[PDB]
């Protein structure tokens, strides 16, 4: 996490202050440089992590899409099962009628 | 997108250079301040957008989970449908036998 702009200013003031000792001036300069570098690292990290979460979210959805596709196939299978039984149950309805007429 | 650390250095050098005119020194100081502020804005933007993509990815998955749950319910329904037909088809098998014995 980078310094808030208020804080980065306090460091610039010190750095740009000819009243403070050149040892403090130099320490400030370092903090400036490190805090900047830090912010740039966070930039690179978060840009990579955003892209990463994107590819990951999309990948995980595609897992659920193929899971759903698996379910649809099972669903069409239960239709084939249901149809097979139905064609026979109907055939038996026809039959039981014929035997009821013939024998009554 | 923030300046690469190499570039941020070129600006610090100018800023900290007593040989260059105080007008350039001041312009550099501004660029420093703006580029820093810029990086901090990108920080805030990307932290918010990462959290946002997170809540969004999780929300979209929960949409597919409830879509799948809808499918499971339809699947259990096709079992109730299938069972109902099966109990009757079996009852007819018993019946057609009885009529085949009684009348042959
Ligand atoms: Cl068909
Ligand atoms: Cl049962
Ligand atoms: Ni620091
Ligand atoms: Ni800085
Ligand atoms: Ni600039
Ligand atoms: Ni800076």
Structure tokens at A100: 């009821």
Which residues 60-99 on chain B approach chain A with CB closer than 8 angstroms? 60-61, 64-65, 67-68, 71-72, 74-75, 78-79, 81-82, 85-86, 88-89, 92-93, 95-96, 99
For ion ligand 6, residues whose CB falls within 5 Å: A 36; B 32, 36
Asked if B95 and A96 touch (Cβ cutoff 8 Å), the reply is yes
**Pairwise CB contact (< 8 Å): B2 & A39:** yes
Distance, in Å, from the CA atom of A22 to the CA atom of B22, rounded to the nearest integer, reads: 20
**B99 to chain A nearest CA, in Å?**
7
Kindly give, in sequence order, each residue whose CB lies less than 8 Å from that of residue B11, ignoring residues fewer than 6 positions away: B3, B28, B31, B32, B35
Task: Note every long-range contact of A2-8, with CB atoms under 8 Å and residues 24 or more positions apart, other chains counting.
Answer: A2/A35, A2/A38, A2/A39, A2/A42, A2/B39, A2/B40, A2/B43, A3/A35, A4/B40, A5/B36, A5/B37, A5/B40, A8/A32, A8/A35, A8/B36
CA of A45 to the centre of ligand 4 (A): 18
Say which residue the tokens 């105080």 belong to.
B22
Structure tokens at A14: 């010190």
Distance, in Å, from the CA atom of B36 to the CA atom of A8, rounded to the nearest integer, reads: 8
Strand intervals (E) in B57-96: none
Kindly give, in sequence order, each residue whose CB lies less than 8 Å from that of residue B23, ignoring residues fewer than 6 positions away: none
Structure tokens at A101: 């007429």
Q: What is the 3-state secondary structure (H, E, C) of A17-83?
A: CCCCCHHHHHHHHHHHHHHHHHHHHHHHHHHHHHHHHHHHHHHHHHHHHHHHHHHHHHHHHHHHHHH
| Chain A CA closest to residue B67 | A68
Domains annotated on chain A, with CATH = 5-102 (1.20.5.400)
Q: Is B4 on the interface with A (CB under 8 A)?
A: yes
Say which residue the tokens 């200013």 belong to.
A9
b or e along A2-41 (b: 16 or more beta carbons within 10 Å of the residue's beta carbon)? Answer: bbeeeebeebbebbeeeeeeeeebeebbebbeebbebbbe
Distance, in Å, from the CA atom of B8 to the CA atom of B32, rounded to the nearest integer, reads: 7
Please choose, from the candidates B67, B87, B23, B22, the residue with its C-alpha nearest in 3D space to the C-alpha of residue A61: B67
Say which residue the tokens 């400030």 belong to.
A28
Residue B10 phi, psi (nearest 5): -50, -40
Q: Is A29 on the interface with B (CB under 8 A)?
A: yes
């Amino acid at each position: 996490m980078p310094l808030k702009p208020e804080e980065h200013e306090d460091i610039l003031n010190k750095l740009l202050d000819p009243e403070l000792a050149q040892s403090e001036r130099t320490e400030a300069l370092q903090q400036l440089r490190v805090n900047y570098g830090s912010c740039v690292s966070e930039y690179n990290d978060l840009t990579k992590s955003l892209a990463r979460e994107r590819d990951t979210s999309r990948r995980l959805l595609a897992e659920k899409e193929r899971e759903m596709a698996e379910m649809r196939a099972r669903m069409q299978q239960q239709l084939d099962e249901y149809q097979e039984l139905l064609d026979i149950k109907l055939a038996l309805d026809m039959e039981i009628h014929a035997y009821r007429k013939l024998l009554e």
